[PDB]
Design a protein around this ligand. Structure first.
Ligand SMILES: CCN(CC)CC(=O)Nc1ccc(C(F)(F)F)cc1NC(=O)c1ccc(C)c(-c2ccc3nc(NC)ncc3c2)c1
Length: 246
């Protein structure tokens, strides 16, 4: 029920390009704006490319970018809804994003946690949670997404032994929180990857960002407990963020 004739689409602007294909902004039947991921032929099997689509059919939730359609005849396409304000990391840097209050910022962080909770509920693992993979709707709501290919957001265990789990994602969420309260600042200000790698094996943790509440900073630290099983659940994180301001 997801297949649609290629004729229903018009690609307007290419958002990005890479090894396995391209991303375009377009329109479906001239009335709906959409983002389109097209596979560059003979770059990876149609099967492997469509696995992304099958995963999106599975994970439908208010806090996750939703799949709209698919075109299964080469050039193979994956069509989704389009978010006017783009990614969270970019938006926060605009005047519109800088003018946002700490209240609004925690509401957005709550929404992200809510979506991750969903992801947790479904035994899924994001592997790349960061503000760049967060889309901002036209109403400033937040949806979880993943565009593709950087150590700053990865938990130590994942970095060292490649152990990516939902706990690996919680840690990334902690990093993401720093992005949200500095309005787009890169984490570990001033440090190169090698430096963040070094500091970590020493138990170093990001210093509290300016204008970051003390309670919010401790929530981040919980997300950064060395032992993965010591990190909170996204459900607990959502709950705490929504009630942050009673
Ligand atoms: C590790 C990499 N893996 C493996 C391949 C990818 C993967 O598994 N992806 C992945 C994994 C999980 C989930 C979900 F959360 F739903 F469960 C979604 C996605 N994919 C996307 O987010 C996505 C797919 C197609 C398009 C067209 C866009 C997409 C690109 C760009 C956009 N810009 C704007 N506005 C500016 N608005 C909307 C979009 C949507 C985004």
């Amino acid at each position: 029920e997801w297949e649609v004739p290629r004729e229903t689409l018009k690609l307007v602007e290419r958002l990005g390009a890479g090894q396995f294909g391209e991303v375009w902004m377009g329109y479906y039947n001239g009335h709906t704006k959409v983002a389109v991921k097209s596979l560059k032929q003979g770059s990876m099997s149609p099967d492997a490319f469509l696995a992304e689509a099958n995963l999106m059919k599975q994970l439908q939730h208010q806090r996750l970018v939703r799949l709209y359609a698919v075109v299964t005849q080469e050039p193979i396409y994956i069509i989704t809804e389009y978010m006017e304000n783009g990614s969270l990391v970019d938006f926060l840097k605009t005047p519109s994003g800088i003018k946002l209050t700490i209240n609004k910022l925690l509401d957005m962080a709550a929404q992200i946690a809510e979506g991750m909770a969903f992801i947790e509920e479904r035994n899924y693992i994001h592997r790349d949670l960061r503000a760049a993979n967060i889309l901002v709707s036209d109403t400033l709501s937040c949806k979880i997404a993943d565009f593709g290919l950087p150590i700053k957001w990865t938990a130590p265990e994942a970095i060292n032994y490649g152990t990516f789990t939902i706990k690996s994602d919680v840690w990334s969420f902690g990093i993401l929180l720093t992005e949200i309260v500095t309005h787009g600042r890169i984490p570990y200000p001033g440090m190169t990857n090698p430096e963040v790698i070094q500091n970590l094996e020493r138990g170093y943790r990001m210093v509290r960002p300016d204008n970051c509440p003390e309670e919010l900073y401790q929530l981040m630290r919980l997300c950064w407990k060395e032992r993965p099983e010591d990190r909170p659940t996204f459900d607990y994180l959502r709950s705490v963020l929504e009630d942050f301001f009673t």
